[PDB]
């Protein structure tokens, strides 16, 4: 009940920090994916 499973209290443990850093890296690699594919990354045509 006071663990990191609940969304609010999760941010206290640095495991949340590590997880978000890693998922940020594995999201930012998608930018290089779009770089290779020649597509558009600098803008999003959804929910502007």
């Amino acid at each position: 009940p006071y663990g990191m499973s609940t969304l609010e209290y999760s941010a206290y443990d640095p495991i949340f920090f590590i997880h978000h850093s890693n998922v940020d890296r594995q999201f930012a690699i998608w930018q290089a994916l779009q770089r290779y594919r020649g597509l558009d990354y600098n803008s999003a045509n959804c929910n502007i």
Binding site: N45, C46, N47, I48
Partner: peptide, 30 residues
Amino acid sequence: TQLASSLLESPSVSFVPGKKDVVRYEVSAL
């Protein structure tokens, strides 16, 4: 009757791309 507006959420916006008669002028704009 003017019904509520909560039963419909916020509309989203999106964009899609696609596929004689002489007239003397000033010397500054020349």
